[PDB]
Write an enzyme that holds these catalytic residues in place. Structure first.
Site, PDB file in Angstrom:
ATOM      1  N   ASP B  39      90.110   4.211   6.583  1.00  0.00           N
ATOM      2  CA  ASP B  39      90.180   3.255   5.372  1.00  0.00           C
ATOM      3  C   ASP B  39      90.930   3.842   4.305  1.00  0.00           C
ATOM      4  O   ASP B  39      91.058   5.054   4.244  1.00  0.00           O
ATOM      5  CB  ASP B  39      88.497   2.844   5.178  1.00  0.00           C
ATOM      6  CG  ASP B  39      88.404   1.521   4.328  1.00  0.00           C
ATOM      7  OD1 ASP B  39      88.374   0.505   4.912  1.00  0.00           O
ATOM      8  OD2 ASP B  39      88.443   1.734   2.909  1.00  0.00           O
ATOM      9  N   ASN B  91      93.213  -3.405  12.068  1.00  0.00           N
ATOM     10  CA  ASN B  91      92.278  -4.443  11.201  1.00  0.00           C
ATOM     11  C   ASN B  91      92.437  -4.566  10.015  1.00  0.00           C
ATOM     12  O   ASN B  91      92.256  -5.497   9.391  1.00  0.00           O
ATOM     13  CB  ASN B  91      90.827  -4.185  11.475  1.00  0.00           C
ATOM     14  CG  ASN B  91      89.971  -5.071  10.850  1.00  0.00           C
ATOM     15  OD1 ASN B  91      89.764  -6.285  10.700  1.00  0.00           O
ATOM     16  ND2 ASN B  91      89.409  -4.507   9.448  1.00  0.00           N
ATOM     17  N   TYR B 157     100.576 -14.279   3.404  1.00  0.00           N
ATOM     18  CA  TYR B 157      99.452 -13.954   4.200  1.00  0.00           C
ATOM     19  C   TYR B 157      99.544 -14.686   5.761  1.00  0.00           C
ATOM     20  O   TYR B 157      99.515 -13.975   6.689  1.00  0.00           O
ATOM     21  CB  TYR B 157      98.260 -14.286   3.723  1.00  0.00           C
ATOM     22  CG  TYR B 157      96.848 -13.859   4.551  1.00  0.00           C
ATOM     23  CD1 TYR B 157      96.207 -12.619   4.418  1.00  0.00           C
ATOM     24  CD2 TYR B 157      96.270 -15.056   5.230  1.00  0.00           C
ATOM     25  CE1 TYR B 157      95.200 -12.327   5.146  1.00  0.00           C
ATOM     26  CE2 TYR B 157      95.094 -14.521   5.986  1.00  0.00           C
ATOM     27  CZ  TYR B 157      94.831 -13.396   5.982  1.00  0.00           C
ATOM     28  OH  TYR B 157      93.480 -13.106   6.500  1.00  0.00           O
ATOM     29  N   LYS B 161     100.641 -12.957   9.423  1.00  0.00           N
ATOM     30  CA  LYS B 161      99.646 -13.255  10.582  1.00  0.00           C
ATOM     31  C   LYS B 161     100.374 -13.704  11.659  1.00  0.00           C
ATOM     32  O   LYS B 161     100.142 -13.717  13.051  1.00  0.00           O
ATOM     33  CB  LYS B 161      98.369 -13.984  10.171  1.00  0.00           C
ATOM     34  CG  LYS B 161      97.692 -13.206   9.195  1.00  0.00           C
ATOM     35  CD  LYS B 161      97.160 -11.972   9.847  1.00  0.00           C
ATOM     36  CE  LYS B 161      95.731 -11.197   8.858  1.00  0.00           C
ATOM     37  NZ  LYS B 161      95.252 -10.194   9.291  1.00  0.00           N
ATOM     38  N   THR B 192      82.190 -12.608   4.987  1.00  0.00           N
ATOM     39  CA  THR B 192      82.236 -11.259   4.371  1.00  0.00           C
ATOM     40  C   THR B 192      81.806 -11.249   3.113  1.00  0.00           C
ATOM     41  O   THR B 192      81.847 -12.143   2.626  1.00  0.00           O
ATOM     42  CB  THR B 192      83.675 -10.310   4.547  1.00  0.00           C
ATOM     43  OG1 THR B 192      84.703 -10.952   3.730  1.00  0.00           O
ATOM     44  CG2 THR B 192      84.195 -10.493   5.975  1.00  0.00           C
TER      45      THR B 192
HETATM   46  N1  LIG Z   1      87.967 -14.706   6.216  1.00  0.00           N
HETATM   47  C1  LIG Z   1      88.167 -13.570   6.524  1.00  0.00           C
HETATM   48  O1  LIG Z   1      87.430 -12.583   6.276  1.00  0.00           O
HETATM   49  C2  LIG Z   1      89.206 -12.871   7.874  1.00  0.00           C
HETATM   50  C3  LIG Z   1      89.476 -14.212   8.747  1.00  0.00           C
HETATM   51  C4  LIG Z   1      90.446 -13.928   9.605  1.00  0.00           C
HETATM   52  C5  LIG Z   1      91.129 -12.584   9.745  1.00  0.00           C
HETATM   53  N2  LIG Z   1      90.668 -11.706   9.014  1.00  0.00           N
HETATM   54  C6  LIG Z   1      91.530 -10.504   8.940  1.00  0.00           C
HETATM   55  O2  LIG Z   1      90.296  -9.226   9.365  1.00  0.00           O
HETATM   56  C7  LIG Z   1      90.742  -7.971   8.506  1.00  0.00           C
HETATM   57  C8  LIG Z   1      89.796  -7.370   7.830  1.00  0.00           C
HETATM   58  O3  LIG Z   1      89.640  -8.209   6.943  1.00  0.00           O
HETATM   59  P1  LIG Z   1      87.945  -8.634   5.857  1.00  0.00           P
HETATM   60  O4  LIG Z   1      87.611 -10.112   5.857  1.00  0.00           O
HETATM   61  O5  LIG Z   1      87.060  -7.672   6.737  1.00  0.00           O
HETATM   62  O6  LIG Z   1      88.489  -7.686   4.766  1.00  0.00           O
HETATM   63  P2  LIG Z   1      87.617  -6.515   3.955  1.00  0.00           P
HETATM   64  O7  LIG Z   1      88.389  -6.261   2.604  1.00  0.00           O
HETATM   65  O8  LIG Z   1      86.168  -6.856   3.860  1.00  0.00           O
HETATM   66  O9  LIG Z   1      87.896  -5.175   4.972  1.00  0.00           O
HETATM   67  C9  LIG Z   1      89.339  -4.657   4.908  1.00  0.00           C
HETATM   68  C10 LIG Z   1      89.231  -3.268   4.608  1.00  0.00           C
HETATM   69  O10 LIG Z   1      90.557  -2.670   4.911  1.00  0.00           O
HETATM   70  C11 LIG Z   1      90.665  -1.553   4.133  1.00  0.00           C
HETATM   71  N3  LIG Z   1      92.148  -1.624   3.662  1.00  0.00           N
HETATM   72  C12 LIG Z   1      92.960  -2.295   2.800  1.00  0.00           C
HETATM   73  N4  LIG Z   1      94.260  -2.056   2.850  1.00  0.00           N
HETATM   74  C13 LIG Z   1      94.285  -0.553   3.484  1.00  0.00           C
HETATM   75  C14 LIG Z   1      95.380   0.095   3.707  1.00  0.00           C
HETATM   76  N5  LIG Z   1      96.805   0.080   3.231  1.00  0.00           N
HETATM   77  N6  LIG Z   1      95.162   1.520   4.357  1.00  0.00           N
HETATM   78  C15 LIG Z   1      93.784   1.483   4.742  1.00  0.00           C
HETATM   79  N7  LIG Z   1      92.785   0.642   4.780  1.00  0.00           N
HETATM   80  C16 LIG Z   1      93.277  -0.641   3.948  1.00  0.00           C
HETATM   81  C17 LIG Z   1      89.980  -1.987   2.798  1.00  0.00           C
HETATM   82  O11 LIG Z   1      89.749  -0.435   2.248  1.00  0.00           O
HETATM   83  C18 LIG Z   1      88.711  -2.337   3.308  1.00  0.00           C
HETATM   84  O12 LIG Z   1      87.667  -1.559   3.462  1.00  0.00           O
HETATM   85  C19 LIG Z   1      92.009  -8.542   8.022  1.00  0.00           C
HETATM   86  O13 LIG Z   1      93.329  -8.258   8.452  1.00  0.00           O
HETATM   87  C20 LIG Z   1      91.754  -9.739   7.502  1.00  0.00           C
HETATM   88  O14 LIG Z   1      93.212 -10.786   7.309  1.00  0.00           O
HETATM   89  C21 LIG Z   1      89.696 -11.828   8.042  1.00  0.00           C
END
Ligand SMILES: NC(=O)c1ccc[n+]([C@@H]2O[C@H](COP(=O)([O-])OP(=O)(O)OC[C@H]3O[C@@H](n4cnc5c(N)ncnc54)[C@H](O)[C@@H]3O)[C@@H](O)[C@H]2O)c1
Ligand SMILES: NC(=O)c1ccc[n+]([C@@H]2O[C@H](COP(=O)([O-])OP(=O)(O)OC[C@H]3O[C@@H](n4cnc5c(N)ncnc54)[C@H](O)[C@@H]3O)[C@@H](O)[C@H]2O)c1
Ligand SMILES: NC(=O)c1ccc[n+]([C@@H]2O[C@H](COP(=O)([O-])OP(=O)(O)OC[C@H]3O[C@@H](n4cnc5c(N)ncnc54)[C@H](O)[C@@H]3O)[C@@H](O)[C@H]2O)c1
Ligand SMILES: NC(=O)c1ccc[n+]([C@@H]2O[C@H](COP(=O)([O-])OP(=O)(O)OC[C@H]3O[C@@H](n4cnc5c(N)ncnc54)[C@H](O)[C@@H]3O)[C@@H](O)[C@H]2O)c1
Ligand SMILES: [Zn+2]
Ligand SMILES: [Zn+2]
Ligand SMILES: [Zn+2]
Ligand SMILES: [Zn+2]
Ligand SMILES: [Zn+2]
Ligand SMILES: [Zn+2]
Ligand SMILES: [Zn+2]
Ligand SMILES: [Zn+2]
Ligand SMILES: [Zn+2]
Ligand SMILES: [Zn+2]
Lengths: 251, 251, 251, 251
Positions: B39, B91, B157, B161, B192
């Site tokens: 992270d 992720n 975004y 993707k 989340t």
């Molecule tokens: N609605 C949603 O929550 C959803 C739906 C589909 C896909 N996703 C994808 O799932 C993944 C995680 O999303 P989430 O919802 O759990 O978000 P989140 O913000 O709860 O978790 C993401 C984590 O990634 C870390 N991060 C961000 N940029 C970074 C970087 N440059 N280097 C290192 N760490 C970094 C952040 O510190 C954070 O702890 C993303 O790719 C998101 O697009 C999320």
């Protein structure tokens, strides 16, 4: 040590006397599922049931033709009589006449639609209503890479497979609110001993060349995906298509 | 009692400090995997390694920026210390500015591409070679429903993707012969704490209606699919896209 | 002020008397296509032919049912009698029973499949062989956005339209060598007379809100794509699915 | 005798100097479009305007790099001066290096993305704003077969083209209300003279076999679809991806 939350529920596996259906039944039972193994072949369906019983699992064999809507009714009542029906795998499929679209025989086309599409429809009707009343579930329909792409001389097959994705979606949309999930699985070419024993060593090696991974899939490899999609783990996975094709459709 | 074939190897979970990344690391560790939680946020990543460790799991934290290719070289070393690396989940991802294409800031576009696409590629480079060297493995790129379909005002975004499916497809084709699988996972809107914290009750409802199941998904529900496709049980699944969307894209 | 390279050749158009198939036949014949307007309703096919002839175009009516394979043998022969059959638009379709998958009438399911899929297959058989014969041509299959995505309670229809995409793909692959191109068109919701006639203004509104453009399509707008694909301009377009849906499937 | 309703307005064709961009300029112009060839090669862009004025049309060059956001701003000013801007083909693309994902050059990746995707985005921002004000228009974004499926050793390209379908979807959704259509074209391998020049006989034969039609596409064939989708005849088509591949993706 793969295990899936598929216990305390009955599970129908149509065409489960051989190949991928067999791999599905065995896998589902071996995570505690009460597996109703249905097949045109009474003896194969029993032969599988015997392994599941021998492995330590509950399983029963209904013999029948999935093209008979009544048989679909009678597989759901037989399953429900082991445990609540909370899993159905509409796997039963034939491969059909090997001919071009202009040369395809009207009976052979109709047969391939009747089995590979309409029988899945007939089967789903009493699966959706049962699962819906008894609080939810997961129907897995057996599609193919050929429900996405073409293959020459297998138009009816290609067509049936393609149809399934739409019936999958629709059932999923309509019964989401009843917490019944409907997904489709999309294998590449699997070494079901029909395949192995039908193909030349020259032919086998050609298809192998179509898949990036450089082999045919094994039944157990489809079953593992089916079991995951059929489990409580896949509770947010509905209406969708899922490939198991060693990278066939990726090029 | 869900359990996945991921023991006796190390797993990199990028953006594993929070949300779906955190669910994934937890779920992967719990089945025997040695999880390197990476992270930006070093303390979040630590907090997560503790839950793993207080649940009997094995894991370590590495804080860095996935946008730095080096940090991706450094993540693979750190993982390969723990155990031979055979899983990587790219992720880490961010939201980007809420605007129409024609009103989008050239920085917020470039930023969302860099993190949500380029950084996924940067991590993949060493991830692949290391997996190939040690006889194979599995990379799961976190995509979305929005790698398939649009959402209005989230162009940067959606674009990123969409991109990920291509990258996923090429990597899979190119490293099949090394037994290195590459897949992508498309969640729908996941509940989340940041989404729970950001959404008005009205906006939350609107998104719920868009999913057939009549709710947002839970992180653990994405975590499960990811764990499975990362596992030996998914050994014939590569180059493919897998939705966990509650029927969002089925209409 | 658009013209299409569809001259010096004959063009079957099933479901010709009404809505979209009518617009097709008009557009094709206005670029000098010899249009066989085929339909259940003799007197509806006749009324279109007359509009063509009135605008200067060469057209013939041939009333019957596409569910009779004989009637596609005959439709082709009677096309070849005007000019070489180098175009066929399998457009004729029906909607079927508004009911859930579980409650769906078997009669209605088999009747919706038969018309929308099997009749396309029966009529494509002599089409393919006939166009192959006059050294090439182009078949256009009238699918839907609902060959891509679901609409609940129209399961059979959705299933049918999904199927066409496979048949279309397989035809293309199989007869590419003989320079006969096959392609599907996928309209969104179109304000045909019968759609304007049976939708309540409330329903109509709700549908317009699912299309980006904020309106239903017109038939003029489907025929143009059909015409273009059926022309010599689309010489490198075979096996593909072409959406005319005003942004419906982009979200 | 193909003509397209693209008159009483200006078009941008980026990369309009050579190959599929040149065919597009020629086709658009001939149907009464006022083309603004924009390209790097100052000379080639001019030589295409010359062919356009020689056949009798209206055209202007504007030599520049699309990767410069200002050059997009300038291209649109130039177009709005000829006639109100209602076409924009973002055609301008590069190959990038032939390497595996794990070995791929970080700058060659960043370069490819910059042109193939970001430049299309940079360009779109003024394109979209101008078309909304002057009462609608169309933006055709040049993708490829490689926006859907992989190709080994061209991962940056495949990635960039996949991305286009997301940007294309989003734009389309956002400005459908302002009657700006946004679409993508997916050509297969096209034997443009630069491709005629760079292929060995062995390599050309290999690609031809991958296409159902058993030959590479001609640039005129891509030029025709672009022209159609750009035209008033395509007024219910937005957000969609249109293959011109020769059955490449149908298997
Ligand atoms: N609605 C949603 O929550 C959803 C739906 C589909 C896909 N996703 C994808 O799932 C993944 C995680 O999303 P989430 O919802 O759990 O978000 P989140 O913000 O709860 O978790 C993401 C984590 O990634 C870390 N991060 C961000 N940029 C970074 C970087 N440059 N280097 C290192 N760490 C970094 C952040 O510190 C954070 O702890 C993303 O790719 C998101 O697009 C999320
Ligand atoms: N390469 C492959 O083998 C492959 C790949 C993709 C999908 N599939 C699909 O997987 C499923 C199983 O395929 P397989 O290769 O394991 O087949 P298989 O031939 O090994 O076994 C299929 C079983 O279906 C049964 N069956 C056939 N018609 C029936 C009917 N009308 N009623 C009841 N039972 C009937 C047969 O008894 C047979 O044992 C089929 O739907 C097939 O389309 C197969
Ligand atoms: N919203 C829409 O109207 C819409 C949108 C997408 C796709 N489509 C498809 O477009 C096609 C035409 O539909 P439409 O909207 O113009 O409907 P329509 O009812 O106006 O036209 C259908 C025509 O086909 C004829 N027909 C029906 N069954 C026949 C048979 N067995 N043999 C011969 N003729 C037969 C009918 O008499 C009628 O003339 C169908 O394939 C339909 O599914 C329609
Ligand atoms: N086989 C094919 O030709 C094929 C197939 C599918 C897709 N495509 C796509 O079609 C488009 C056109 O390619 P082509 O086949 O005509 O290739 P080409 O190289 O012959 O033409 C591309 C043109 O873009 C120009 N250009 C490059 N970078 C530029 C920049 N930064 N600013 C302005 N102009 C620039 C070049 O000078 C050239 O004239 C590209 O987007 C390409 O990726 C090509
Ligand atoms: Zn018997
Ligand atoms: Zn036997
Ligand atoms: Zn074997
Ligand atoms: Zn919660
Ligand atoms: Zn949708
Ligand atoms: Zn009559
Ligand atoms: Zn009447
Ligand atoms: Zn009207
Ligand atoms: Zn040439
Ligand atoms: Zn393919």
């Amino acid at each position: 040590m793969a295990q899936y939350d598929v216990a305390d529920r009955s599970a129908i596996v149509t065409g489960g006397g051989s190949g991928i259906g067999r791999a599905v039944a065995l896998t589902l039972a071996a995570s505690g599922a009460a597996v109703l193994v249905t097949d045109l072949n009474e003896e194969h369906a029993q032969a599988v049931v015997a392994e599941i019983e021998a492995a330590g699992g509950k399983a029963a064999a209904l013999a029948g033709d999935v093209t008979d809507p009544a048989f679909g009714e009678a597989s759901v009542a037989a399953a429900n009589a082991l445990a609540p029906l909370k899993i159905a795998v509409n796997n039963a499929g034939i491969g059909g006449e090997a001919a071009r679209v202009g040369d395809y025989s009207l009976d052979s086309w109709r047969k391939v639609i009747e089995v590979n599409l309409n029988a899945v429809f007939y089967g789903m009707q009493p699966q959706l209503k049962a699962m819906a009343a008894n609080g939810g579930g997961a129907i897995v329909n057996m599609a193919s890479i050929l429900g996405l792409v073409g293959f020459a001389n297998s138009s009816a097959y290609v067509t049936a497979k393609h149809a399934l994705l739409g019936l999958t979606q629709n059932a999923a949309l309509e019964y989401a609110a009843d917490k019944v999930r409907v997904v489709a699985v999309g294998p590449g070419f699997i070494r079901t001993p029909l395949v192995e024993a039908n193909l030349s060593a020259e032919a086998l090696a050609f298809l192998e060349g179509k898949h990036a991974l450089g082999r045919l899939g094994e039944p157990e490899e489809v079953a593992s995906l089916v079991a995951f999609l059929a489990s409580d783990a896949a509770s947010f996975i509905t209406g969708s298509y899922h490939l198991v094709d060693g990278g066939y459709t990726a090029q």
